[model samples]
Target: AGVRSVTRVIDLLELFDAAHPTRSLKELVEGTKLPKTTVVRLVATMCARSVLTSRADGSYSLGPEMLRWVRLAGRTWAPPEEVVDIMRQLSADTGETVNLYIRQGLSRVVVAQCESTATVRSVIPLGVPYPLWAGAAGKILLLAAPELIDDVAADSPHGPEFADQLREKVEDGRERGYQLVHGERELGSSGLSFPLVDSHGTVVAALTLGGPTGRFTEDRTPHYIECTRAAAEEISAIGLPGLD
Candidate 1:
């Protein structure tokens, strides 16, 4: 691994998830803080390896290789079972996809996703990733770990805006017990997510729910928030290693 390329690759990898599947190069540059030339080179190389893919319009996304890895990893690992189970229940109950996410470096990657049974729901294919500064799950992961913000900022050349995004989410996540994501991250989807606190009370993961904004509007979120928080508590109590 070219050490620098490794860092850039990881940074870019963290930018995808079922929650935010496509991203522009400008978004990558701003979020990763990599020099434009370096970012371009890194993404191009990854795209060549099938580690990432680019759209006709130039947006990049996690490629088929990543989706395959995620499917295999989910079947192999038991660590996220607690959260994954509850997400399934949520998907069944709400007829919306439910997701569980965890931090890997400065981003939140969808460790698991439970698709809704309803035909009218929004769907995010399994194992997609999103930046910790980007969407509902991202905000929840950042909200759970205020300290991680400083670390992300120190290494990311993107400046203080990244740090500010975390701070804002932390406060909102705490005060609201969950963060509500509007259409800013994606034009049609909206989401609700909450911090998954470990036994010691440190936030370690995020539980997220998403659907088209029409199906999950501002009026319907309170119940979803409560359910997700309750689910997160159950997952945390299992004494899972990373979550603790």
Candidate 2:
């Protein structure tokens, strides 16, 4: 059965992000749309649990537990630091923003990113959610969870007809071992993605390079794909626990 309280806890906690890392009780209450008393109780318990901590002026920020939780999650959710370094290396080699993407429900999240030096290059925020029905990074991840295609179609901003297109891409991506697209998610942005496969040959994540469509020329395509494939191989060699 679905648990409501945990979702409420998640909703409240998710109110804090990079831009608004600290929040007051009233802000949390407004953010969550919960009763004041309920917010107070939840905040108090979260404070005690070391998930949040209070400032002297009464605002709350992430607590000491964040260190342990974030570090542990980084280990499993993001690629290892060396693997992330590979993204940087690949970015430099290809002159495009590199990303390690993992699926979260219906969204694809950029867990690790290395920005390109070019002024007009793509720069995606870390940990921000991107929909699954668009982009190469978004679509490549679906090969591992094809069952969710219908749900994605229903949830897509694009219409019901998008489901068949998504399925077509996923199936072809499996055969091709990579995907390339332009302006699928955001206009003028281009993306090329390769699967990060585990020891058992299961796709665990998507290693993608994104940039301005102007930079994704046919002449540069082969070089970008090769570099991205090499980087993806380095990340995939390390097993991703629980993805299987």
Candidate 3:
């Protein structure tokens, strides 16, 4: 017996080699030169077997099984080890909880976190998953591209309406290169996210600094956004397979 695989799957996987961790189906088709229907079928079949999973609204990712496999294969595939130090700096510099996250399905899994030194803080445990429609880091990751802004709206609780507010936030982030979330997902949890590129020069993970709502209100949100963006740029510059 011989191992057999579809050519389209191979092509789909090639898309990840790009600086961008996630690519839209349109990007995939163009990149692979595969027919749209064939690409859809091949990707769907791969997704069913846990080979890949769709991100927030438009992109696909290596699934849990594949992620686990890659984690093992790379063993040291740390996206932001120095970024962890920067996260600490972001917290120390601003007294907010800091986190590093990567996409998984329609949510993000926190891979690292640092607690704020403030009297009160919202500590999201490492490895905990949050919805793409939930918080700063989650939303920023979901809003990868232009159309993703709409995809997020379609998938959210309030659908497009609720997503409008999120879109506004994303736009603001795009302009300033940082995003903020004000307790939309949790009453006392508010935070900011700064997209960080991988070695491939694609925004693969989001760096976030979260804190108690009192300190992260709309009036003061811009402060966090600036701080997070500064920190994220530092991380992006140090890009590597692990420990960027």
Candidate 4:
């Protein structure tokens, strides 16, 4: 009985992904194929624990507690050596900081990083969360997960111009398999990122490089993008399952 209940909870959670982030009770029932009574009971329990939230329109979506758990898991976990080695190699090749990020709610959390040996470099600490619409890494995650765009943009405090630019950036990133941002996240800082897709073709993570904009000039940016893409591909080739 306990095992079955746990399975139902996991099934309900799994139903909310990059495609369908919010659902009505009827939708959840149909998605899970569970009895109405069972769905209600489980959903109620989840809502009580803040794992799921109910809207005025009677739809349910993942709640703040999910973010808490994601942050907790990120803090406790260490990325595999293959991923670390590639990040380090990319940092070495580009002479910049490298970060590995995954989406958590409307934010991207850095799971791992390799700091450059350069005297001046940009580095984001591991397990730090940043807005999903800010940096190149965050935009890469948003671009790879379209379902997140509307909600993340809706919650973003940035101006309309930022949103407009985000759309253009995403389009460009899609075409080139990577993105570049200068002085967006921080003044004089530049970033580039590429998606790391799993064997199932779902974007599981983003590999990003950060450095001073002076070193990220138009003439030198292509090399950074290429190196980041190569590193992302190597990580994807590992075929590790998604954390979700």
- Taking all chains together, each candidate's TM-score versus the true structure is 0.59, 0.68, 0.62, 0.67
Badly placed stretches (over 4 Å) of model 3 are 1-80, 145-155, 163-165, 199-201, 217-223, 240-244
lDDT of 1: 0.73
- For model 1, which pairs clash? 16-129, 16-130, 17-128, 17-129
lDDT of 3 by residue, 1-244 (tens): 1233455577688788536777788988899887899788788888899888888888887777676666575544555467668888888877887888877666678877788777788677776666777777876676565466666566777744676787777777667676666777778777778888766555678888777778876666676777777887787887745534
Q: How do all the candidates rank in terms of TM-score, highest first?
A: 2, 4, 3, 1
| Candidate that beats the other on TM-score, 1 or 4, i.e. the better one | 4
lDDT of 4 by residue, 187-208 (tens): 9998888888877677778888
Worst 10 residues of 3 by lDDT: 1-10
Instruction: Rate residue 190 of model 4 by lDDT.
Output: 86
Best by lDDT: 2
- Tens-digit lDDT string for candidate 1 (120-204): 6656655565556556777677765677777755655466666775576668778777877778467888888877776667777
Compute the lDDT of residue 143 as modeled in candidate 4: 68
* Model 4 lDDT at residue 232: 83
Tens-digit per-residue lDDT, 57-175, candidate 2: 88999898777866666556645678767888898899898888889899998877899899998878887888898899777899999999989888887786888888998999999
- Candidate 2, residue 36: the lDDT equals 95
